[PDB]
């Protein structure tokens, strides 16, 4: 099993969620994060003064899936989350050695 971790623009949440649910991926965890990278914030104005948001709001969506679901989940996330502009985000794949469902004590494939 693998953890799929996608850093996306927050407004893309609904699209990504629909895409995953449609692909039979029915559970996911979402965290708020700030991204720093090539995409810059617009040097804005508040009380008539300059400043820049340096760490931009993103969401991290985490799903644990079977090894043979990674490419499919990746493809779905990419199509739902992309805009073509810098700042679209990244997907990271890492190993998950065990999953346990807290309610039952069920493990692995039976816990997700």
């Amino acid at each position: 099993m693998k953890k799929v971790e996608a850093i996306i623009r927050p407004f893309k949440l609904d699209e990504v969620k629909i895409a995953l649910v449609n692909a039979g991926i029915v559970g996911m965890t979402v965290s708020e994060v700030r991204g720093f990278g090539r995409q810059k914030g617009q040097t804005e104005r508040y009380r008539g003064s300059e400043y820049t948001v340096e760490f931009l709001q993103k969401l991290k969506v985490e799903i644990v899936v079977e090894d043979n679901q990674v490419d499919m989940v990746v493809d779905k996330i990419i199509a739902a989350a992309r805009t073509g502009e810098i700042g679209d985000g990244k997907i990271f794949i890492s190993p998950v050695e065990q999953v346990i469902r807290i309610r039952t004590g069920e493990k692995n494939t039976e816990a997700v």
């Binding site: 927050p10 407004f11 708020e32 931009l56 709001q57 969401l59």
Partner: protein, 86 residues
Amino acid sequence: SETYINHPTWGLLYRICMVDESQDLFTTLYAQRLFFLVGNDIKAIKFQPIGRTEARMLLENRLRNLRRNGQSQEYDQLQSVFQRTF
């Protein structure tokens, strides 16, 4: 320009449109679906609830003004927000 704010109860909100210089219309990302009007120029942040029907009508009005003004990029972007939201 993506703009977000955090609501203490509902969590992260996304600006669906800039109503004017002092005022933004936001929707909930985690709940389906609440709307809030929020003032820019206020030290205490207040979240004025806005009904779903009204939210829809307000965006349609703005859509119509953007196309009359030939603000086609801003129209296209708002149109996609509208389609996603409603």
